[PDB]
Amino acid sequence: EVKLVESGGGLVKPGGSLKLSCAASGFAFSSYDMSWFCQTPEKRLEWVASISSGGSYTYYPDSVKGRFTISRDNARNTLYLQMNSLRSEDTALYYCARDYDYGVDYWGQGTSVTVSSAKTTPPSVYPLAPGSAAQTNSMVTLGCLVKGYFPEPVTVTWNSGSLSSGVHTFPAVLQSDLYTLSSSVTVPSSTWPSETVTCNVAHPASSTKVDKKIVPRD
Amino acid sequence: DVVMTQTPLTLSVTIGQPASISCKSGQSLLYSDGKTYLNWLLQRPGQSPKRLIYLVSKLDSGVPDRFTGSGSGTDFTLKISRVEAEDLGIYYCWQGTHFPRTFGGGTKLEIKRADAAPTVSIFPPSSEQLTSGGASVVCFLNNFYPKDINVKWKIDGSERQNGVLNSWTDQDSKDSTYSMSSTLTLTKDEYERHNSYTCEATHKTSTSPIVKSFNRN
């Protein structure tokens, strides 16, 4: 089975450097040309760089030419992308891919790069409980507003993962170099309350966890 | 540098029905060796791209032959003879004939389902958030179909477009609905100066807008 596993992405300042790699297995790595592609936050796909099986020929579009270097270690089945002079436009999910059959046949899973001089900021997590009155007896929906963090991603669960159905966690939107997102959960009334409901928010970039109990009122 | 243009941008299809996607390039993709390096791939929500077609019409062996590719020159088509629920995703065409490789912008294929009304909930700003001098009113509009919805905020009867942040989920792979959140963020002082807060949803599923509201006092 062809398998490509990228790593090394993260948040980097404009002008800075990052080195990505791709661990290839399940095939004779040395026989194939290999490529980098990226997917922008708008879901545009773009070709980034290609390298000949052997290592000698490298190909780059104008957009990265002079900044990035693709290279490979045939002895360790590993592909690399050395990204220098990063730009905000380079913000993307970067994929390793195998060139074969007049194009490209297998893609990896992607590693995420954000290029930004904005600072890492933990989220404020706000509980959303229904207003003083009070629609539907039956199901009740509760929310968590996760505001003002940087960079992506955060993860949101409810009751440490045991409320999973009835959940909608929306994509984050970037506003002033801060992300905001919300999550709703829908549960039987009579279950809330008593039974307690907590959104669990994690933000790895800031090593932060917030576990916010939804209590009646606001 | 070769411009790749896909049509339509989104395509809504019933399971069992055919679908067709078009890809037009800015110059011919036929190379001197008589081959045309025109490719199609699918990216399902949250997944890696998967090859569908290479050299115009050669089928990836993991892809059922309900998918066909055809065309030549600058005009190409991907057809799906009968759509299944797992075809949901974004289809891209891309060319390798001319350096540099270039992609079409993608066609989102969505699954048709029976009409569904949004379940609408409004949440006044939390009291923790007001202590920090901000006031976000959140409105959730869950599990609706079709995707076409308009949402209006009204403060004391007055439609308000400023300070809203909308966000939409992908089509749910289990019930084929959509969901959205709409967030009105004001400073606390302006939250203070009004009484009445309304989230208003317009949708083909009801003869009157779906209205959810609260009033401070």
């Binding site: 040309d33 290609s50 000949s52 099986s53 052997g54 000698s56 020929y57 190909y59 060139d99 074969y100 059959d101 007049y102 194009g103 | 190379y31 001197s32 060796d33 390096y37 390798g96 004939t97 001319h98 350096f99 490789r101």
Partner: peptide
């Protein structure tokens, strides 16, 4: 065909 390196036109066949 059967047969070739199956590379795109702008590739130089590798070693």
């Amino acid at each position: 065909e059967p047969v070739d390196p199956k590379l795109e036109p702008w590739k130089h066949p590798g070693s």
